[PDB]
Design an enzyme around this catalytic site. Sequence first.
Site, PDB file in Angstrom:
ATOM      1  N   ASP A  89      45.038  66.152  54.659  1.00  0.00           N
ATOM      2  CA  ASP A  89      43.709  66.190  54.050  1.00  0.00           C
ATOM      3  C   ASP A  89      42.679  66.689  55.048  1.00  0.00           C
ATOM      4  OD1 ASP A  89      45.308  64.962  52.250  1.00  0.00           O
ATOM      5  OD2 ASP A  89      44.256  63.039  52.201  1.00  0.00           O
ATOM      6  N   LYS A 151      39.604  66.823  47.248  1.00  0.00           N
ATOM      7  CA  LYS A 151      39.405  65.386  47.386  1.00  0.00           C
ATOM      8  C   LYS A 151      37.916  65.078  47.448  1.00  0.00           C
ATOM      9  CE  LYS A 151      41.069  61.726  50.570  1.00  0.00           C
ATOM     10  NZ  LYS A 151      41.800  61.527  51.851  1.00  0.00           N
ATOM     11  N   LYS A 180      41.842  64.301  43.921  1.00  0.00           N
ATOM     12  CA  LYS A 180      42.051  62.954  44.418  1.00  0.00           C
ATOM     13  C   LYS A 180      40.729  62.218  44.519  1.00  0.00           C
ATOM     14  CE  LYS A 180      43.865  60.445  48.455  1.00  0.00           C
ATOM     15  NZ  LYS A 180      44.567  60.530  49.772  1.00  0.00           N
TER      16      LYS A 180
END
Lengths: 211, 210
Positions: A89, A151, A180
Site C-alpha cells: 500500500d 485506498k 479498500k
Amino acid sequence: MKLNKYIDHTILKPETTQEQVEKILAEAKEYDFASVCVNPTWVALAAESLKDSDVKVCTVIGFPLGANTPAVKAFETKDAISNGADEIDMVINIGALKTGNYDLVLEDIKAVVAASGDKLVKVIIEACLLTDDEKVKACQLSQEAGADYVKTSTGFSTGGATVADVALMRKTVGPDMGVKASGGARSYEDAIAFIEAGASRIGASSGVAIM
Amino acid sequence: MKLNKYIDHTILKPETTQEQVEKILAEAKEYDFASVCVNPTWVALAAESLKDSDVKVCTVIGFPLGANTPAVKAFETKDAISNGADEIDMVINIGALKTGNYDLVLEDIKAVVAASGDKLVKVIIEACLLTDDEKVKACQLSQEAGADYVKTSTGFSTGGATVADVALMRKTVGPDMGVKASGGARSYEDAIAFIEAGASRIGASSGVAI
C-alpha cells in the site's frame, strides 16, 4: 460469496513492539483474515509467521506522508517484497497532487508498480485532505498507472473512510479495480456499511467485528 | 543577540504545496536561517533555490514513524544527498528500541550514517513515546553509531520538545554532539528556553520570531 476475507488486520503505531505484532499475527491466523498490515520492519517476521496460512503479508510504502521520491518508493517496494510482502500500500504524493503535478504523481505510482513484480499494489489517496474532484483525479491517476486498488486513508490523518468517499471512489474506478476502506471502522455495521458502499477490502485493527 | 543560525525553517505536512515550500525558502533566504527542512520530494527544488546562499538543505529519512528497513533508510539518505541534501534527520526505529532490539536500532542508524558521506546526520528519538531511560539509551546508541545530532521529535506524535528532555539529552551526549529541539517552539522565549537547556538547534515553523 465472501465473508471476512475483506479484512486486513492492521497494526502501524510507531511504538508497536514485536509481542504486539505477534499477537496480531496470532489473531490473523485464528480468524483467517485476508492479511496483516505492518510496517516494513515487521514484514520478514510476519512472513515467517504467516507461511502455512492463506493470510497474506501486507505492508505500507512511503507511509504515511507519501512525500518520498519515486526512486525511494520503488526501492522500498522491492525491498519489502524481497522480505516476504505479498501486498503493497503506497501513499500517493499528496503534495504533488495538490500543486497540480499530475505528471509527478503518475510517475510516482508507476515507479512503485514497476517494482511491484507480480504483487498486489494499493494506492492510498487519503481522501480527507482532498476535494471531491481531487479524490476522482487520484483514483483515475492510480488506475492509469495500472494499480490494483485505491485506498481511502492512512489512518494517520484527520479522517478515515466515509461511505460517500468509498462510493465516489467505486463510481470513479469501476468494479474491476478494488477499493479498500481503511479508517475508523470499528464495528460490524461499519464494515457492512462500507461493503454495501462498494468496498472489496477493509483495513482495521478490529478483526473481532461481531466475530 | 540573535537566533537566526539556530533555526531550521520547517514545513513537513503531507498536503504541503510548492508555493508553500517556496515561501519557506524565501523566508529562509530573508532571515538567513541555518537551513530549511522539507520532505525528500522537495529537496531538489530547495537545493536549487538555496544555491548561492548560507542556508543549507535539510530533509527527513524514515519520517515520521522510523519503521522502515535499514536498507531503505540508507538508500533514501543516499538519494536525498544525491538530490541536493546537506543534512539528514532520520527517525530512530522506535518499535525496535521499545522491543529491546538495540542491535537493530544501532544497525539502522549505522546504515544511515554509512550512506551519509560527509554530511551531518541528526537522529530523531521521539522522546514523547519513551521513558527517561529510553531517551538516554536512544542518545547513547545514536552517538555510538557516530551521528552528529539527536533531535527530540518528529512533530507528528503526541508531544514535542520539553526542556527536561533536551537537558537530559545534552547531559547524555556530552557537549560536542548536537541537540535539536523540535516542536516547541512558538515564541522567542520558547527558543531561548530550549537553547539554555542545551540545544544547539531548533526546529519550528515559526522561524519569523524574529
